[PDB]
Design a protein around this ligand. Structure first.
Ligand code: NA
Ligand code: NA
Length: 274
């Protein structure tokens, strides 16, 4: 009745969940295209909208509900299952239905999450260039205790070329890369020195607008696995700092190969949340 997306077992989320740690009472904001809050496998407690004309609890694109689903789709007898199924989900709409947003929508969205007490911030969005506003934004959210996790990018490797982008490029934000189910890197996964960890990314099946589920590809999909894993780490050890969580994710990761392609490795929430 309920589907267990290959990702959950691949990062050992099921192990920690069996320990009784499901991300409960941990606040998680998803800066995206909105969230089809009425979806039966999702529980959006609240959020804000920084895109004109669109509320925060609707997903005109689909990307948002998908990424929310990876982090916290309700542990029940329907749909899929999320990495941290008991987390407090927050929809922070910063991308419109085309999957585009402005530096100010995004900056406003981060500023809100930091103000409102979010523990983890997930950003499955990016761009070629950053901004002083965005950099200072993520720097504060991080310094204030938030775990900012961002997609690395989907530009492959152009040789020496660092295809990693903002917000992921910055050092207060964890840049996540995508591996398939065989634990191999994905052709689209951006490469660069600031690549931190690898989380499932190809063939990711999750919640999709209009009460259904779809399969997507992208580091957009890798990202919520880590935003998710940070939540299980925080529920189990709520006294940890963002740097302490970040370190556990990266330090216990399973080595796959060169960091310019894999960062420290594929993540392991069981060893991390140890
Ligand atoms: Na479910
Ligand atoms: Na980074």
């Amino acid at each position: 009745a309920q589907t267990v997306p290959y990702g959950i077992p691949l990062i050992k989320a099921d192990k920690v969940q069996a320990q009784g740690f499901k991300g409960a009472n941990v606040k998680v904001a998803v800066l995206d295209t909105g969230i089809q809050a009425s979806h039966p496998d999702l529980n959006v407690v609240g959020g804000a909208s920084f895109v004109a004309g669109e509320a925060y609890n609707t997903d005109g694109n689909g990307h948002g509900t998908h990424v929310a689903g990876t982090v916290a789709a309700l542990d029940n007898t329907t749909g899929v299952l999320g990495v941290a199924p008991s987390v407090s989900l927050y929809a922070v709409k910063v991308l419109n239905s085309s999957g585009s947003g402005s530096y100010s929508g995004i900056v406003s969205g981060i500023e809100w999450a930091t103000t409102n007490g979010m523990d983890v911030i997930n950003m499955s969005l990016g761009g070629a260039s950053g901004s002083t506003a965005m950099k200072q934004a993520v720097d504060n959210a991080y310094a204030r205790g938030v775990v900012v996790v961002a997609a690395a990018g989907n530009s492959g490797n152009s040789g020496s070329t660092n295809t990693i982008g903002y917000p992921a490029k910055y050092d207060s934000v964890i840049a996540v890369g995508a591996v398939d189910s065989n634990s191999n890197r994905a052709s689209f996964s951006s490469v660069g020195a600031e690549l931190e960890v690898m989380a499932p990314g190809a063939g990711v099946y999750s919640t999709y607008p209009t009460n259904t589920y779809a399969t997507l590809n992208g580091t957009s999909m890798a990202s919520p696995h880590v935003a998710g894993a940070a939540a299980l780490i925080l529920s189990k050890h709520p006294n940890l700092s963002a740097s302490q969580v970040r370190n556990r994710l990266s330090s216990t990761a399973t080595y796959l190969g060169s960091s310019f392609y894999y960062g420290k490795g594929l993540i392991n929430v069981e060893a991390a949340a140890q």
